[PDB]
Amino acid sequence: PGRPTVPQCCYGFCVDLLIKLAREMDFTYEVHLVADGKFGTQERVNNSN
Amino acid sequence: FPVLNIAVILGRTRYITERDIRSLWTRDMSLDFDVNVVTLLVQQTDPKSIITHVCDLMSGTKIHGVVFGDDTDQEAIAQILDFVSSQTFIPILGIHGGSSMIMADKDEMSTFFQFGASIKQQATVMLNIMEEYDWHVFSVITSNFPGYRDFISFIKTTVDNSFVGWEVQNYITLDTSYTDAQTLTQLKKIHSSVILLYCSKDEATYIFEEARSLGLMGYGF
Amino acid sequence: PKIVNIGAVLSTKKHEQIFREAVNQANKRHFTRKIQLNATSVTHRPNAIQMALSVCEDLISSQVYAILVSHPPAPTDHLTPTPISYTAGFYRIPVIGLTTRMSIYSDKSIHLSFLRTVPPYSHQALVWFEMMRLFNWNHVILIVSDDHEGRAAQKKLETLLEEKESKADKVLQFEPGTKNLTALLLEAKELEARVIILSASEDDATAVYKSAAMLDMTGAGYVWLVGEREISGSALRYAPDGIIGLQLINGKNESAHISDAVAVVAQAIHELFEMEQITDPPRGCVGNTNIWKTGPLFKRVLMSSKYPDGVTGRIEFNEDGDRKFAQYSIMNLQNRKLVQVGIFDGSYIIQNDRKIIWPGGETERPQGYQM
Amino acid sequence: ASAMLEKHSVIPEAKTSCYGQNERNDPPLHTLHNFMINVTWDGKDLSFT
Numbered sequence: 290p291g292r293p294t295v296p297q298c299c300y301g302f303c304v305d306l307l308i309k310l311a312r313e314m315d316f317t318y319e320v321h322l323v324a325d326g327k328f329g330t331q332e333r334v335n336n337s338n
Numbered sequence: 339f340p341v342l343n344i345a346v347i348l349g350r351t352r353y354i355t356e357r358d359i360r361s362l363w364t365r366d367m368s369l370d371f372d373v374n375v376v377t378l379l380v381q382q383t384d385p386k387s388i389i390t391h392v393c394d395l396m397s398g399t400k401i402h403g404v405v406f407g408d409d410t411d412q413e414a415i416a417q418i419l420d421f422v423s424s425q426t427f428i429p430i431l432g433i434h435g436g437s438s439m440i441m442a443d444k445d446e447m448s449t450f451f452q453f454g455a456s457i458k459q460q461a462t463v464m465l466n467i468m469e470e471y472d473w474h475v476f477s478v479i480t481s482n483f484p485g486y487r488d489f490i491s492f493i494k495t496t497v498d499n500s501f502v503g504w505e506v507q508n509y510i511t512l513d514t515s516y517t518d519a520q521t522l523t524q525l526k527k528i529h530s531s532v533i534l535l536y537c538s539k540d541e542a543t544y545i546f547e548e549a550r551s552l553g554l555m556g557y558g559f
Numbered sequence: 560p561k562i563v564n565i566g567a568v569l570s571t572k573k574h575e576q577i578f579r580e581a582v583n584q585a586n587k588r589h590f591t592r593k594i595q596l597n598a599t600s601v602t603h604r605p606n607a608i609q610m611a612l613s614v615c616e617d618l619i620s621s622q623v624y625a626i627l628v629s630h631p632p633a634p635t636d637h638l639t640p641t642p643i644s645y646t647a648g649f650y651r652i653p654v655i656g657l658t659t660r661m662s663i664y665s666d667k668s669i670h671l672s673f674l675r676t677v678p679p680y681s682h683q684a685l686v687w688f689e690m691m692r693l694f695n696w697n698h699v700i701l702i703v704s705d706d707h708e709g710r711a712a713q714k715k716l717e718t719l720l721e722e723k724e725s726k727a728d729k730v731l732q733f734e735p736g737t738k739n740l741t742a743l744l745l746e747a748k749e750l751e752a753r754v755i756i757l758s759a760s761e762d763d764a765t766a767v768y769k770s771a772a773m774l775d776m777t778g779a780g781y782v783w784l785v786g787e788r789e790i791s792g793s794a795l796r797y798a799p800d801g802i803i804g805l806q807l808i809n810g811k812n813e814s815a816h817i818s819d820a821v822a823v824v825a826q827a828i829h830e831l832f833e834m835e836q837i838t839d840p841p842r843g844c845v846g847n848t849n850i851w852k853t854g855p856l857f858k859r860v861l862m863s864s865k866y867p868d869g870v871t872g873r874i875e876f877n878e879d880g881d882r883k884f885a886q887y888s889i890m891n892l893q894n895r896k897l898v899q900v901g902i903f904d905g906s907y908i909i910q911n912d913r914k915i916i917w918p919g920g921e922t923e924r925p926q927g928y929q930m
Numbered sequence: 931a932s933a934m935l936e937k938h939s940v941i942p943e944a945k946t947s948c949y950g951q952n953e954r955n956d957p958p959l960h961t962l963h964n965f966m967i968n969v970t971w972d973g974k975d976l977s978f979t
């Protein structure tokens with residue numbers, strides 16, 4: 290109910306793709322899910338707007 | 339007890355004496371808090387006259403607070419007194435006319451500030467009028483004085499909410515330095531319902547002359 | 560011949576004498592019969608709000624057709640010549656600064672009557688883009704103080720980049736007077752780009768280098784580009800090696816800068832005199848609330864006044880009014896001392912014979928993308 | 931003043947305005963000019979912008 294960063298295990302199509310790239314691609318990967326619930330969209334920043 | 343030191347100045351072409359209101363305010367002033375008042379008046383406004391006089395009264399007596407009164411609406415005046423405020427750090431305010439008239443963004447050091455209002459807000463007032471009868475405003479132009487850049491943003495901020503269906507057609511600047519024509523030919527391009535003006539009355543005078551030639555004076559503008 | 564007064568505020572009485580001398584030379588330079596020139600000036604006693612009093616009392620009362628101004632030898636705060644631009648503003652009297660290269664008065668919406676020959680610190684970015692252009696690093700980082708100065712520099716450089724695909728990666732804003740600044744650099748390490756450019760005051764710059772050295776930012780594979788102010792003053796004593804730097808040409812000499820402005824102004828007024836219905840600047844501070852109609856016209860002709868030959872160098876002004884084609888001398892920190900690796904004039908850089916220095920001592924250090 | 935002076939603050943005089951450049955004996959310490967921007971008078975809501 291209270292949400293705070295948490296270490297988790299994630300497995301996916303996009304993950305298999307990412308590692309496929311990682312073998313194909315030299316770059317090494319560390320993944321953390323975004324805190325924001327939505328991917329997000331450009332929006333007015335309250336008072337800043 | 340505290341016996342504060344205060345000064346007020348009435349400048350005018352309309353008849354009243356500071357004395358009249360002096361004693362009045364001290365009577366009204368009397369019960370709420372201690373106050374010591376020196377009143378002075380000067381007939382017509384000048385950068386030199388005002389600066390000299392205010393320094394002349396302030397230095398002689400260690401006044402802590404003052405106000406300003408005038409029967410004139412000159413635009414530059416506010417800034418001048420504001421400039422004095424940045425250096426002095428003495429609170430100042432004004433109750434009528436030009437001092438009450440709006441001024442450019444206040445400096446980091448606090449200045450005198452009664453005339454100023456959020457131009458943005460002022461525009462939102464105007465927008466309320468626009469909301470009732472105005473949509474797709476003909477033009478907003480940063481022609482002269484303070485906030486040419488500043489006014490420009492807010493229109494965007496107003497438009498940015500995108501709560502309703504807002505839009506702009508004309509968005510340019512300029513006036514006096516070259517042929518009015520570069521701005522004018524651009525202005526000819528816009529075809530909209532309400533002209534938005536952010537220029538001084540002096541500029542405006544010329545703008546009036548521009549609009550008649552322009553055809554802005556005609557219905558739908 | 561009507562002596563057309565001129566007025567000025569200058570550092571010292573000797574420079575006043577220099578002014579009067581140049582003015583007297585003036586009759587020979589621009590047809591003598593058409594105009595008469597008289598010189599008036601002040602030695603700028605440091606009264607914050609009274610010198611201006613006298614400017615109005617004396618100079619406005621003297622109806623000077625124009626005023627010259629220079630930065631005071633004694634240094635108090637910065638951008639002291641704020642009041643005059645406002646005060647003459649009612650007068651609509653052209654002002655010409657000799658020493659004000661600062662960008663604070665760039666805001667012509669309130670500094671409308673204001674003018675100068677030297678380019679501001681913001682315009683230095685013209686060099687950096689050209690510098691960036693040569694070396695082919697599209698990826699950089701910008702560190703600016705938070706004020707009209709830094710933000711203006713950012714706007715200018717970004718505007719330069721706008722013609723290209725906009726390049727805004729890693730802009731970094733810090734606020735002046737801050738001693739603790741290391742935390743931000745820890746954030747800076749994460750960014751891919753390895754080239755850095757910064758603008759700040761000398762006092763702040765000490766703190767910047769002090770904090771940067773702690774995190775070992777200066778190391779090879781990193782590049783530093785900077786403003787004239789940064790290389791100067793206390794900034795040097797705790798400072799790093801192999802960092803590019805800039806110095807405006809002719810900054811040191813005020814009298815030299817002044818002779819040139821007057822010759823240039825002379826073209827503006829003499830040419831201006833021929834035009835019909837000109838009005839004298841408002842006579843007497845008192846009794847006036849109205850502008851001077853001509854001033855904008857004087858500005859319009861003066862945009863095209865041409866005096867490329869000059870003591871200071873070529874002279875032309877853009878729509879903004881800031882000088883054009885300014886020349887800077889690139890500086891290097893070799894052996895913890897300032898040296899000219901090259902000199903920059905016009906739109907093209909020039910390479911002096913001196914060997915290039917970089918962080919780590921490599922002769923050439925082009926690659927900025929370690930990733 | 932009742933909100934500043936009465937509430938542990940000193941309301942300093944202007945002191946120096948027309949001479950030299952001495953920084954006016956520095957800025958007044960704890961001047962507290964802008965502590966209140968939303969006040970009333972006679973019950974009038976004269977809160978300020």
Ligand SMILES: *[C@@H]1O[C@H](CO)[C@@H](O[C@@H]2O[C@H](CO)[C@@H](O)[C@H](O)[C@H]2NC(C)=O)[C@H](O)[C@H]1NC(C)=O
Binds near residue numbers: 811812814815
């Ligand atoms: C700034 O200009 C002054 C005056 O023109 C220069 O002072 C001269 O220096 C030269 C040195 O070669 C002397 O021969 C002259 O007697 C000095 N006064 C003159 C020329 O009348 C000064 O050198 C210039 N500043 C710099 C850094 O060059």
